[PDB]
Every structure is written in structure tokens, then in C-alpha cells.
Amino acid sequence: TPSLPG
Amino acid sequence: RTPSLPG
Amino acid sequence: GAMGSMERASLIQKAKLAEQAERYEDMAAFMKGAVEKGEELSCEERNLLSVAYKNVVGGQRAAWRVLSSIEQKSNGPEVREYREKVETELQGVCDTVLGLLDSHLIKEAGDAESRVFYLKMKGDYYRYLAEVATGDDKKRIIDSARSAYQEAMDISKKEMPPTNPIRLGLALNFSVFHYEIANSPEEAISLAKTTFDEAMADLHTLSSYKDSTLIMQLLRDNLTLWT
Amino acid sequence: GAMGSMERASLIQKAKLAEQAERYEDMAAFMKGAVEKGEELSCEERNLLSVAYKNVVGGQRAAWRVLSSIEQKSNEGPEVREYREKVETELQGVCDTVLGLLDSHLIKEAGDAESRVFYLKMKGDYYRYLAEVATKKRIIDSARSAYQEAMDISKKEMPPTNPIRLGLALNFSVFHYEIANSPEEAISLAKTTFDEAMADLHTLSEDSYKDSTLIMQLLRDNLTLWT
């Protein structure tokens, strides 16, 4: 699952 | 620059 | 301490040059040197620190995942040995970031936004450790990540509106922690859902709308994958 | 050194894993350790060595160019120069490492033509990279001498379609154009190389035809750029 992209 | 061999 | 003899302003300048040159290890080392001067970071500087180390650890995480995948399929010692080498380097980077946050960015942070930013970052870097940890060490790391995230949550609910992008990104990452690391999908879903709903109620008061809605959609993507 | 206790075959295996993980500094260090075992490199191993260091120095050259451009614009504090010098020194260190491996371990009188040309071309290339940052005559002549020895061997011992011979001619022509201020020679070399390979393509299998024509296409790209 993706986390904050920055 | 001009390109050289890519490998 | 290799940066101890360089002026703070020179380290910040060189961090920006390193970013332009896509030299992220250099950028992180310069930002580490700047942090170790002992002064608070501005918002721009906090973002430089985070970008630099995320690029470094992100490359290590991707390499670790490649090697771990080769290792799973292979099941000589070489794949494991090299995976362990990359793992140790990743652990070193995370330990470095966690050391900067504990000495002394978190305690020195002068406003709620910066404190939440750093406590979230502490949770994130323990989470990166948790991805490669095993056994009792993993359990301790997981508890450390949860405690940092929860402290950030407590502060953001008292001091930030529910649409605040930093608050939203904290909830996003904490929910990812619950789902991917702590095997707590119900906590992950509950947190993402509550965060989504409480921000949605205030979207009409925003100019900011773009920023908050972007992170709300990141929460939504995870909810869809999760539900 | 750090690789001295590792088996040759394990170093090669880990170089291949490092490539899969895009960890080219590691790949280069493993291949250096393999070279230091003192056995000749196979064709596949020569390619691993070359790819690894190409990627390392490629990133350094790209960063050096970024910083040099910034420095030139700032010339219409010392930080830009200092950081460009830091990257330059690291780049020179890698070139010195490669040239050291070539001179101490790999360049021999008693090789097959394919290896002798491969390594002398490589020597020319790494002197050329040093020449890009030098301010130079002696480095330029070292590159020229290495390329010229490789050319002499390649014309006597390899067919005009041989891919190693073609790639050497491509890079020597780039040397003439970009480093040695000899664009007429660069153009003549690319032309005659292309034409002499064209005339012998009919002797090649489908596989060899693909390998040769791909490099011929690069020669033509440079010719059409330059004329």
C-alpha cells in the first residue's frame, strides 16, 4: 500500500 | 556532447 | 561529524546543489550536517531533509525488495548475504535519521506543525526498519513506530484543523502502518475513514482544496484496496 | 581488501545481483574484487566490469556537468566551486581505479584480440573522461595512444563488422570530435568505419547482423549530427 509520495 | 557507445 | 567545519548556510546551499545534480547521498549528508548545528529547521529545510533521506532510503528499500524476491524464489548463500548487506545499510540510514529526530529535532520543534512533521517522520523510519526486521526486534520496532505516530496524532488533533495537509499525510502513513506492518486492517480502515470524513466536512471552507483533496484521494485509494 | 576473503564465483554472482538491484557501486566493487583474483575475465565478465564502472562514472559525469554549468553561470561564495571540485575529485578517483585495474591486471601482450582491444578501448575511454574535466594535453595524448593501439590491433585481427571494433571506432571518433578538436578526422573515421562494415554485412548471420548494425546505426547518428 502506498504511503505519502513526498 | 556527442553520444558514445551506450555500453 | 565530517560536516562540522562547514557553515550552516553553506551546507544548505550545497544540499540544494546536490539535489539539482541528483546526488541524494550528498544531499542527505549536507542536511545531516545542517541539523547537527543544533538550530531549528525552517519548513523549506525540513522538506530538504525529508526529500534527501527519502531518496536514499527509497533506493535501498527498492533494492532490498528486489533481492528479497530473488531470495524467496531461490528457496548458495550469496543472495542472502547480499540482501543482508543492503539490509544493514538501510538500517544504518534509518538509525541515522532516527538519531537526528531524537537528538534533537523533535524536542526543539517550535510549533505544532514541525513537531507533527518530525514525529510522523520518526514513525515512518521505524516503519522502514519494521519492513526488514524479524522476531523480538521487529516487535519492539513496531511498538516504537506506533508510539511516535500516536503522539503525532494527539498533537495534530489538538492543534491542526482536520484538512491540514500535514495532519492528513500523518493519518495516511499511520493507516499504512496499521495495514502493512501491524496486521491491523480494521484499525487502518477506521483511521483512514475517520480522517477522510472529518476532512470532507470542511472542504468548503478552503481556498488548499487541491492539497487536501489530493491526500484524501490517497486515503481513498488505500480504502478501496483494503475494502 | 574487503573482497579478498570472498570466492571469485561469489563475487561474480553478487555483481549480477547488484546489477539487478541497480546498485552499480556495489557491482563495480564486486567486479574489482573478481579482477584481483588474478584470473583472466571471460567475455561475460568483461561486460559486467564495464557496465558497472560505466554507470558509476556516468552518474559522476552527469553531476559534474550540472555543477559546472551552475558554476559557469555564477561566474557571469566558494560553495559551488567547492562542491564541483568534490565531485570532480571523486570522478577522477574512479577513473584512476579503472585505469589501475587495466594496467595492473587486465592489459596484457598475450591476449586474444577481442580482450586486448576491449581493454585498450576502455583505457582510452577512461582517459577521455579524465580529459573532460582537465585543464589536459598529456591526458589527451594518453587517450589517443590507447585508442590508436586498439585500432591497430582491431584492423589487423578483426573483421570490419566486429562489434568491439565498431564500438572502438565510434568512441575514438567521439574522442576526435569532442576532445581532440579534430572534427574532420572524427567524420572521416565514422564514415569509413560505417562503409566498410556495410560492405561486409552480407557475411553475417541474423544474430551477428543485429549486433553489428546497431552500432553502425550509432555511427550514422553521429555522422548525421556532425554533418
Ligand SMILES: *N1CCC[C@@H]1[C@@H](c1ccccc1)c1cccc(OC)c1
Ligand atoms: N514529502 C514529505 C516531506 C517532503 C515531501 C513533500 C515535499 C517535498 C518537497 C517540497 C515540499 C514538500 C511532498 C512532495 C510531494 C507530495 C507530497 O504530499 C502529497 C509531499
Ligand SMILES: *N1CCC[C@@H]1[C@@H](c1ccccc1)c1cccc(OC)c1
Ligand atoms: N558496453 C561495453 C561493454 C559493456 C557494454 C556492452 C554490454 C553490456 C552488457 C552485456 C553485454 C554487452 C553494451 C551494452 C549495450 C550496447 C552496447 O553496444 C551498443 C554494448
Ligand SMILES: [Cl-]
Ligand atoms: Cl555481500
Ligand SMILES: [Cl-]
Ligand atoms: Cl563540498
Ligand code: NA
Ligand atoms: Na553460489
Ligand code: NA
Ligand atoms: Na584471499
Ligand code: NA
Ligand atoms: Na583532410
Ligand code: NA
Ligand atoms: Na545532418
